[PDB]
């Protein structure tokens with residue numbers, strides 16, 4: 090189950106990940122809260138993303 094970005098997002102710190110609308114992710118840890126550790130299938134970068142900015146594909 091893959092996820093896609095709904096809006097652009099600029100990370101505030103090194104811990105979150107910036108991304109563009111339409112970018113897709115594999116989710117690495119969702120059980121930690123509403124911010125999920127994810128990997129971009131476009132760039133390969135990794136970081137936390139807000140789960141309310143993605144939807145399942």
Ligand code: NA
Pocket residue numbers: 140141142143144145
């Ligand atoms: Na969502």
